[PDB]
Write a protein that holds these residues in place. Structure first.
Motif, PDB file in Angstrom:
ATOM      1  N   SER A 192       0.816  -1.208   0.000  1.00  0.00           N
ATOM      2  CA  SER A 192       0.000   0.000   0.000  1.00  0.00           C
ATOM      3  C   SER A 192       0.853   1.263   0.000  1.00  0.00           C
ATOM      4  O   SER A 192       0.369   2.321  -0.420  1.00  0.00           O
ATOM      5  CB  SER A 192      -0.937   0.006   1.207  1.00  0.00           C
ATOM      6  OG  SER A 192      -1.953  -0.973   1.068  1.00  0.00           O
ATOM      7  N   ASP A 193       2.100   1.176   0.464  1.00  0.00           N
ATOM      8  CA  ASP A 193       2.994   2.329   0.408  1.00  0.00           C
ATOM      9  C   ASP A 193       3.258   2.739  -1.036  1.00  0.00           C
ATOM     10  O   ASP A 193       2.888   3.839  -1.459  1.00  0.00           O
ATOM     11  CB  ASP A 193       4.301   2.015   1.140  1.00  0.00           C
ATOM     12  CG  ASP A 193       4.825   0.628   0.832  1.00  0.00           C
ATOM     13  OD1 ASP A 193       4.162  -0.101   0.067  1.00  0.00           O
ATOM     14  OD2 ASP A 193       5.898   0.266   1.358  1.00  0.00           O
ATOM     15  N   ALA A 194       3.879   1.848  -1.812  1.00  0.00           N
ATOM     16  CA  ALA A 194       4.208   2.104  -3.215  1.00  0.00           C
ATOM     17  C   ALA A 194       4.959   3.425  -3.368  1.00  0.00           C
ATOM     18  O   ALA A 194       4.576   4.303  -4.143  1.00  0.00           O
ATOM     19  CB  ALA A 194       2.951   2.080  -4.086  1.00  0.00           C
ATOM     20  N   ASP A 195       6.047   3.552  -2.605  1.00  0.00           N
ATOM     21  CA  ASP A 195       6.826   4.790  -2.532  1.00  0.00           C
ATOM     22  C   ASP A 195       5.948   5.964  -2.101  1.00  0.00           C
ATOM     23  O   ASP A 195       6.040   7.064  -2.651  1.00  0.00           O
ATOM     24  CB  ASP A 195       7.524   5.088  -3.860  1.00  0.00           C
ATOM     25  CG  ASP A 195       8.829   5.843  -3.681  1.00  0.00           C
ATOM     26  OD1 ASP A 195       8.862   6.795  -2.877  1.00  0.00           O
ATOM     27  OD2 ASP A 195       9.822   5.478  -4.344  1.00  0.00           O
ATOM     28  N   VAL A 196       5.083   5.709  -1.112  1.00  0.00           N
ATOM     29  CA  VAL A 196       4.142   6.663  -0.515  1.00  0.00           C
ATOM     30  C   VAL A 196       3.483   7.522  -1.594  1.00  0.00           C
ATOM     31  O   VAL A 196       3.115   8.679  -1.360  1.00  0.00           O
ATOM     32  CB  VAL A 196       4.836   7.508   0.581  1.00  0.00           C
ATOM     33  CG1 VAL A 196       5.774   8.578   0.008  1.00  0.00           C
ATOM     34  CG2 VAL A 196       3.812   8.107   1.550  1.00  0.00           C
ATOM     35  N   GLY A 197       3.289   6.943  -2.775  1.00  0.00           N
ATOM     36  CA  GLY A 197       2.732   7.665  -3.901  1.00  0.00           C
ATOM     37  C   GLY A 197       3.772   7.981  -4.954  1.00  0.00           C
ATOM     38  O   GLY A 197       4.572   8.907  -4.791  1.00  0.00           O
ATOM     39  N   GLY A 198       3.775   7.215  -6.045  1.00  0.00           N
ATOM     40  CA  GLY A 198       4.745   7.416  -7.101  1.00  0.00           C
ATOM     41  C   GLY A 198       5.040   6.159  -7.892  1.00  0.00           C
ATOM     42  O   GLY A 198       4.122   5.448  -8.308  1.00  0.00           O
ATOM     43  N   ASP A 199       6.324   5.878  -8.103  1.00  0.00           N
ATOM     44  CA  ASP A 199       6.722   4.684  -8.835  1.00  0.00           C
ATOM     45  C   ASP A 199       6.379   3.425  -8.047  1.00  0.00           C
ATOM     46  O   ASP A 199       6.368   3.419  -6.812  1.00  0.00           O
ATOM     47  CB  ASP A 199       8.221   4.719  -9.138  1.00  0.00           C
ATOM     48  CG  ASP A 199       9.058   4.977  -7.902  1.00  0.00           C
ATOM     49  OD1 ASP A 199       8.492   5.429  -6.886  1.00  0.00           O
ATOM     50  OD2 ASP A 199      10.281   4.729  -7.947  1.00  0.00           O
ATOM     51  N   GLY A 200       6.102   2.349  -8.776  1.00  0.00           N
ATOM     52  CA  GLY A 200       5.737   1.090  -8.157  1.00  0.00           C
ATOM     53  C   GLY A 200       6.911   0.352  -7.545  1.00  0.00           C
ATOM     54  O   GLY A 200       7.266  -0.742  -7.994  1.00  0.00           O
TER      55      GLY A 200
END
Lengths: 249, 158
Positions: free
Chosen positions: B122-130
């Motif tokens: 759910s983090d996924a770079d806290v919003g951004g690239d996977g």
């Protein structure tokens, strides 16, 4: 009927708080709980009460600021309307628990004192003379995590805090904490004059009084000065006790 | 609790807002417990241990270490993630926590008592690239589904 579980009247982790709520709400379908601080920030959550009117919701996070937080438990009365249904911004007679949440979003947006929210919440919902809804009040100081050692003494009768312990008999150590009784733990360390640890015990249980006791044996201990260290991932307290072959009595 | 409401045949969508439902069905929605099992209790510094745990609703999981501050990411290696099987269980081979490269491992090198936790993708770079490339703070780590357990490191004697 309601209750709030406080370790010492406080919640230790400000970033991620946790309280337990239980009580009896007979005849209701849902129960709303609200948290407001001295600044005026508000957090709300609805609780689905079971068939026999015994609601128990556990591990409720608090996302407020450090200071003093007062808590209220809301319950729609006979009318199944918040009070008289006279919300300042909501519709008439459609004032449910979810509807009152929309009114709460307006409270924190405006620069209102936390004490003003106490006057507003009680006046708009309960203080109205035609209101049938009931609330219960509870307060707790939202502080930071803190652990300390209170008393160290052998199996004898003493409560001053410090007592030399003769080797061969178990000695009890008592300290205070504000952490959750189960989700956290306290680890002890006993070391000699040159960093030779001799004992290591941990506890992860203590009642809501905040007192925890740790048992360590003194079978192979040597007389002298010993250092007691306790940590919980936070600030560490250290205390020194003396070890003697035999005590004076 | 989440409900589903059905309506009588021939009713329009707009006109169905007020009419009561002929029948109903309710279901409950919670969040699954993603916990670790093996990296718990004791750990000899420099030793290797496997990553054992379960994740009900997860695709990629990351391991973080915290000590009096930020949750420094632990560079497990390939893609910094572990897949989950159908049995809601994820596992990894024997990994030396302190041996691996990264600043996250550096915290565990010194003797003491620390905390280690796992978090879903759910983090996924806290919003951004996977990709899981951050050092999530307490609020970021707690906001998503996660779990942490107390760990302490002991000295190694041959």
């Amino acid at each position: 009927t309601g209750q709030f579980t406080t370790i010492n009247g406080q919640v230790a982790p400000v970033e991620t708080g946790t309280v337990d709520i239980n009580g009896t709400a007979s005849g209701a379908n849902s129960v709303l709980v609200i948290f407001v601080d001295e600044r005026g920030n508000v957090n709300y959550q609805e609780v689905s009460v079971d068939s026999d009117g015994t609601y128990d919701e556990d591990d409720i996070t608090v996302g407020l600021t450090q200071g003093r937080v007062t808590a209220h438990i809301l319950s729609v009365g006979r009318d199944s309307a918040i009070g008289d249904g006279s919300l300042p911004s909501g519709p008439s007679n459609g004032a449910t628990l979810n509807d009152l949440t929309g009114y709460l979003d307006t409270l924190d947006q405006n620069n209102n004192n936390g004490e003003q929210i106490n006057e507003l919440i009680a006046s708009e919902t309960v203080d109205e003379t035609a209101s049938d809804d009931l609330i219960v009040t509870e307060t707790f100081r939202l502080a930071e995590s803190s652990t300390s050692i209170d008393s160290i003494y052998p199996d004898a009768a003493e409560a001053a805090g410090i007592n030399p312990v003769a080797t061969g008999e178990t000695m009890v150590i008592a300290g205070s904490t504000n952490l959750k009784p189960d989700d956290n733990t306290i680890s002890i360390e006993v070391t000699n004059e040159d960093g030779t640890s001799v004992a290591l015990e941990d506890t992860d249980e203590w009642n809501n009084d905040g007192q925890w006791m740790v048992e360590i044996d003194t079978t192979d201990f040597e007389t002298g000065t010993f250092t007691v260290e306790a940590d919980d991932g936070d600030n560490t307290d250290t205390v020194n006790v003396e070890v003697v072959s035999e005590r004076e009595d | 609790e989440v409900d589903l409401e059905v309506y009588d045949a021939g009713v329009s969508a707009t006109a169905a807002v007020g009419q009561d439902a002929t029948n109903d069905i309710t279901l409950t929605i919670e969040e699954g417990g993603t916990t670790l099992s093996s990296p718990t209790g004791q750990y000899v510094v420099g030793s290797e241990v496997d990553i054992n745990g379960t994740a009900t609703s997860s695709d990629s999981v990351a391991i973080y270490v915290r000590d009096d501050g930020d949750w420094q990411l632990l560079e497990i290696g390939g893609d910094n993630e572990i897949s989950v099987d159908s049995d809601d269980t994820f596992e990894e081979e024997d990994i030396a926590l302190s041996g691996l490269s990264g600043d996250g491992s550096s915290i565990l090198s010194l003797t003491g008592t620390y905390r280690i936790g796992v978090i879903d993708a759910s983090d996924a770079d806290v919003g951004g690239d996977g990709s899981v490339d951050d050092s999530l703070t307490t609020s970021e780590f707690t906001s998503g589904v996660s779990s942490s357990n107390s760990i302490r490191v002991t000295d190694q004697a041959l």
